[PDB]
Write a protein that binds this ligand. Structure first.
Ligand code: HEM
Ligand SMILES: CCOC(=O)c1cnc2ccccc2c1N
Length: 289
């Protein structure tokens, strides 16, 4: 099973920058969403979920196929709430129908991260829409009620190591949990990409409680929350070290996240030797737009 990247015919950097810009402009002007969080966080989550289906053992799933457009994956309980990201991207796709679904979904996550003042995420095109019988079964994305051993084992399926895992989890500084979506409630409702996930883990006084859906979560007096899988990053000594490193080094966190997030979005894709170099898109701000 090889998924070879194939550049959308006749497209170049500028074409993709235009799609980036459309997403970013819509992020700016659809700012009311989810009590003024905006769509940034959910678009980051969508990019991660469409990528997180990958299995290194047989090379199935991941972003290449754009199979989130299909009913089985669209309706995965693990993807509850992602329909909002899909709806956001739908007019974007109609404006730029030449882009593959997987390129669009992954590009939305890149754009969201950069537009929320995150690190630049290099991004490669060439994901190709594959048929419905390539859609991965439900159950490939991770549960939140688990411990560090689970997180570590889970992520080995996506060929991620401890540093990559800890880096990627910093995305949980963004957005919030929604009881109706996941059985968890709360979060900072933040839309600026920072290293505050790690600072919060280390600095808050956390109490493990049951929530209204009778799930376990960690709550702070200041009103932040952490999933059991989030908190496992300070229970495990290897993860804790890296948590401390990112809490104390914003630039290192940015750089490591950029690498891990790109890798996440590219898992399962074979890039031929004559493929274009990754693109680094300019923000609206850098374009004076
Ligand atoms: C152990 C792995 C992970 C687990 C168990 C997990 C679990 C969760 C849960 C339960 C939610 C709340 C969803 C809702 O209630 O709407 C959430 C939200 C979120 N997750 Fe994760 N996550 C994991 C890893 C990741 C990764 C690797 C990223 C991206 C790099 C990511 C990005 C996000 C973002 C941005 C949100 C907020 C979305 C919003 O505000 O709508 N997560 N996650
Ligand atoms: C502000 C950083 O710490 C948090 O408040 C926090 C912790 N875990 C989360 C897990 C999922 C979504 C949001 C999350 C979140 N916002």
């Amino acid at each position: 099973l090889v998924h070879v990247a194939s550049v959308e015919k006749g497209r170049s950097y500028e074409d993709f920058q235009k799609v980036y810009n459309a997403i970013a402009l819509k992020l700016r002007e659809d700012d009311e969403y989810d009590n003024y969080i905006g769509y940034g966080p959910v678009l980051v989550r969508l990019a991660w979920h469409i990528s997180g289906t990958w299995d290194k053992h047989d090379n199935t799933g991941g972003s290449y196929g754009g199979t989130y457009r299909f009913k089985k994956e669209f309706n995965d309980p693990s993807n509850a709430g992602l329909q909002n990201g899909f709806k956001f991207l739908e007019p974007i796709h109609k404006e730029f129908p030449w882009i593959s679904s997987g390129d669009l979904f992954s590009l939305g996550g890149v754009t969201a991260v950069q537009e929320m003042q995150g690190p630049k995420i290099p991004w490669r095109c060439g994901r190709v829409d594959t048929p419905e019988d390539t859609t991965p079964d439900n159950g490939r994305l991770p549960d939140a009620d688990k411990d560090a051993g689970y997180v570590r084992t889970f992520f080995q399926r996506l060929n991620m190591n401890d540093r990559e895992v800890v880096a990627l989890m910093g995305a949980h500084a963004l957005g919030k949990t929604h009881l109706k979506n996941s059985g968890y409630e709360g979060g900072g409702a933040n839309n600026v990409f920072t290293n505050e996930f790690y600072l919060n883990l280390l600095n808050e006084d956390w109490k493990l409680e049951k929530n209204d859906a009778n799930n376990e979560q960690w709550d702070s007096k200041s009103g932040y929350m952490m999933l059991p899988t989030d908190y496992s990053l300070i229970q495990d000594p290897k993860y804790l070290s890296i948590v401390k490193e990112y809490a104390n080094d914003q630039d290192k966190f940015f750089k490591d996240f950029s690498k891990a997030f790109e890798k996440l979005l590219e898992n399962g894709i074979t890039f031929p030797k004559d493929a274009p170099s990754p693109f680094i898109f300019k923000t609206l701000e850098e374009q004076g737009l």
